[PDB]
Amino acid sequence: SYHISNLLEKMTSSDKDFRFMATNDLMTELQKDDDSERKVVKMILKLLEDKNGEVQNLAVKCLGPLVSKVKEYQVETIVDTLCTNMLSDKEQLRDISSIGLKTVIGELAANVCKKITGRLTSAIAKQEDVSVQLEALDIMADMLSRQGGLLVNFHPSILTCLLPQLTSPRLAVRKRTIIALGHLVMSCGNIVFVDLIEHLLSELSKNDSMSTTRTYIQCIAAISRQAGHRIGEYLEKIIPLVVKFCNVDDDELREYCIQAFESFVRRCPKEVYPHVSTIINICLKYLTYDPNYNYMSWKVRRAAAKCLDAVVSTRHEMLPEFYKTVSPALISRFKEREENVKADVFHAYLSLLKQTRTPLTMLQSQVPNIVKALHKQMKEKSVKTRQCCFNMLTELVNVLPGALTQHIPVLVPGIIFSLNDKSSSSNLKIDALSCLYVILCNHSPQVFHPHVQALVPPVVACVGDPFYKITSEALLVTQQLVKVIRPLDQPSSFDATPYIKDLFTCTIKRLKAADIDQEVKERAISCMGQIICNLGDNLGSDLPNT
């Protein structure tokens, strides 16, 4: 009773240190009388306008826990004064009140929300000032994100003020309106959703301006992402408009249409079945769109490739159709100038390969084209392209074991070139070694016999690399190489004498180190054991020491 009075007396001491410490002590006490409530509330409200920034920050932080302890009546006046200060001319008042109101909303019931909704709806409709509009829109989005189910009676009121703002000259207002509309749709009634959907279709049926069609398509994509199943009934009407707008010459408009197609494919799978062929055809048509260059237009290509990836990664019953039409387009598009779209199409075909695991026969038939297209890209100076090529080979061999029986002579030199390259990074070397290991583990030993003379030196060099991850990968590859050069369960005519000494010499140094990491120790032990098991008869006097 006396400590509170002392704190309130000291919070007006004309010295910043005393005010700061008193506010900190007050916040500590609240985190741990009816008349005292009014004085505390008024003092916090007045310190919101204090000269010192630290005191203002402390007051804003203290407004949070205050609402829980204080009775229901004073929360109303706190909200009222914050909303009133939100419309003041001063910038500091405006933003400090915005932060305080956000803090109040975060720590929170239906009574205050009604007044907040009324004030925000009144403020947003005014277009004279845009800062107030933006702050009110963001606070409404925050209020709708959580405990938004208590505003059932106010949804039409929010709706009729949100929709007029999609034609505002400022783009930030449009984006915040889209966010707020998505949050509203996430939890709302049935009639409001129908009203919004028919409104969007109504002003999409008429093309009033180019700048507004873009934001309408973006909004439809937003509801498609947020609601999902609730928009599947209107796809029969939505799709033809997007198809019509795809053909428009504007480059920016096309990308949003393709993104909307991708969102429809991803979110509502059951109702998108009749339009899958149309979406696939549009994406295939616009995957190779490049008017200036003949063998800013890469955004549409990225969108088309991403939509193809979304289509392939979800549907599993269309695999024959995919291998009939989608795969040749991507394989022909492997040679694209832009690196980002190249990564996108590589990811799309990797998703197709993952979905594959009859389709296997079609994949085997397509393998030669894949190898021919990948061999050209293996010579590029960019690390990312080579990394994607190695990942694709690894995935292809994993899905199909004996895929590359007839293409080892053309595939080995690329791996060799990537391994002994100064510009190559650690990731590229590791991925190349992993690809070589996967290739060796899933092929007949007789294929690699002519290429051992070119495979052994780079691997031996990789064993001595200072970085230990590459050493571990090289030892793992060396084990399989030893198993390959001298098989024990099959008869072979290959001579393994020249390559024994190099492998033993490179492995023994890692075997007796006593300072290297644990993984390299385990790999060295395993590799030396395999060496002794397979080719230990040709070793000299080093076997007892080993």
Partner: protein, 497 residues
């Protein structure tokens, strides 16, 4: 085996519901769960590690569902997941090498990839449990602050600097909102946020002064996000610079209107008048203004003296730029250059060669600055004679050829970035010391007599939101406060007013 166990549990439930009594349900469920799960916990842990090593999300979810039926059975899984995430992040950062030291994009993208992958795993497989999200947060906080990159720099403050540089790179000249949100997600785990704030303020000031920003909306969104995450004082500090920019624009427009009435000037003139206490820039080196710029200098000085009598203007010549259209070459060339390049280029018009001492006297530029700018000009193929000696003769190369009509010869120097970074880190150190001193003084003002441990605890709980102080620096601050006669010792200190 996990699928078999689930099927057997469902079958037992059906059995006891159909043709047994209801009093047997709980006992049968307990016995079946114990026999089928609790006796194979070590095997389950080993398989959990194996499935973490080779990504199989469905199996992880099934294991989580199975082990959830045993009291205190999820702790080992949480510990294993935390260790795995920590090791994966460290390995991912280590593979970058020495390139990540000066490439913020690679560093931040690696961190973001690891965090996104394991956040998706936690939400999908583990049903977004509190323990698993806590383990993910702990692992992220461990591997973000200390890693291979921080060991090369011998400090844990490299990560906030790299994050700030990545933000600057993004904001210089639709998907930007997502990456900004991801960056702000990363910012939550940073222990030293003051370094991030200082560096971001520096880069924002540089962006505003030179007018190279992608858009104003992106800047506003970043300010809003920083308001959500950081405090209110930092945002006020940034809004001060924004207001100064607006005031400078208005003053420039007013001066443009004033110039119409009088005689027009011979060149296009724009000025950025800024407050000296709200911006991080420092006083420029000694410099003599070339004679052809004196008209605009005097005109604007007189205009500002008339408009504001009580203020004086200090000119920064290391942040000014302009155009030098030349007609003494093979064809017409226009080039973008700073004031220093103008001084060491416009000085000779009818002559062809100079010695550095004569050029130094003419331009009044210091030694190192002149050497660096001359090196930059020499590698631009606009000057011909590698080391610059005091007796060297430098002459213009006639007939310089370029493949583009517009040429930019304004390239940052090599040592400038390192010097700026070192200065910023030092300044962060003195600000930390001063903040500690101020906190101690305020605490001792509030409490007349206090102990040592209570003082330390209060200082750390007051400064925690920005940086974590150390005991030696707090002790040194206390000792230097005693020397200044602020508090006196009676291990217990008392405030001496």
């Amino acid at each position: 085996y996990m699928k078999k166990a689930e099927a057997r549990l469902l079958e037992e439930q059906r059995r006891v519901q159909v043709y047994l009594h209801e009093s047997t349900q709980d006992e049968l469920a307990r016995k079946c769960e114990q026999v089928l799960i609790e006796k194979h916990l070590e095997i389950f842990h080993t398989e959990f590690q194996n499935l973490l090593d080779a990504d199989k999300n469905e199996d992880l979810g099934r294991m989580y569902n199975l082990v959830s039926r045993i009291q205190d059975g999820l702790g080992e899984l949480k510990k294993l997941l935390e260790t795995h995430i920590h090791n994966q992040g460290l390995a991912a950062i280590e593979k970058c090498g020495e390139a990540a030291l000066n490439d913020p994009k690679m560093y931040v993208q690696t961190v973001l990839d690891v965090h996104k992958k394991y956040n998706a795993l936690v939400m999908s497989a583990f049903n977004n449990d509190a323990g698993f999200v806590a383990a993910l947060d702990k692992a992220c906080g461990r591997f973000i602050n200390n890693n291979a990159v921080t060991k090369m720099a011998q400090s844990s403050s490299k990560s906030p600097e790299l994050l700030a540089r990545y933000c600057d790179s993004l904001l210089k000249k639709a998907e930007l909102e997502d990456t900004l949100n991801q960056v702000m997600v990363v910012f939550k785990y940073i222990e030293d946020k003051d370094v991030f704030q200082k560096f971001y303020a520096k880069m924002l000031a540089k962006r505003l002064v030179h007018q190279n920003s992608a858009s104003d909306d992106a800047e506003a969104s970043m300010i809003s996000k920083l308001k959500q995450a950081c405090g209110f004082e930092y945002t006020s500090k940034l809004q001060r610079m924004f207001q100064d920019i607006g005031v400078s624009k208005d003053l420039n427009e007013q001066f443009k209107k004033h110039l119409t009435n009088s005689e027009p000037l011979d060149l296009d003139f724009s000025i950025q008048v800024l407050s000296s206490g709200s911006w991080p820039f420092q006083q420029s080196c000694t410099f003599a203004l070339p004679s052809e710029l004196e008209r605009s200098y005097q005109r604007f000085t007189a205009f500002y003296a008339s408009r504001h009598s009580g203020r004086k203007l200090t000119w920064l010549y290391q942040l000014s730029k302009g155009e030098l259209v030349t007609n003494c070459f093979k064809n017409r060339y226009t080039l973008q250059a700073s004031t220093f390049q103008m001084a060491i280029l416009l000085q000779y018009n009818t002559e062809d060669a100079y010695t550095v001492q004569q050029l130094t006297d003419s331009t009044q530029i210091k030694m190192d600055i002149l050497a660096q700018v001359l090196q930059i000009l020499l590698k631009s193929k606009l000057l011909v004679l590698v080391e610059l000696k005091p007796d060297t003769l430098i002459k213009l190369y006639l007939g310089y050829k370029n493949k583009k009509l517009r040429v930019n010869i304004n390239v940052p120097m090599k040592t400038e970035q390192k010097q700026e970074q070192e200065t910023t880190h030092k300044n962060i150190e003195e600000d930390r010391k001063l903040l500690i001193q101020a906190a101690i003084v305020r605490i001792m003002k509030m409490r007349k007599v206090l102990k040592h441990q209570q003082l330390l605890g209060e200082v750390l709980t007051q400064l925690s939101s920005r940086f974590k102080p150390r005991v030696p620096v707090i002790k040194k601050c206390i000792d230097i406060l005693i020397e200044k006669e602020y508090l006196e010792r009676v291990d217990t200190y008392s405030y001496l007013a």
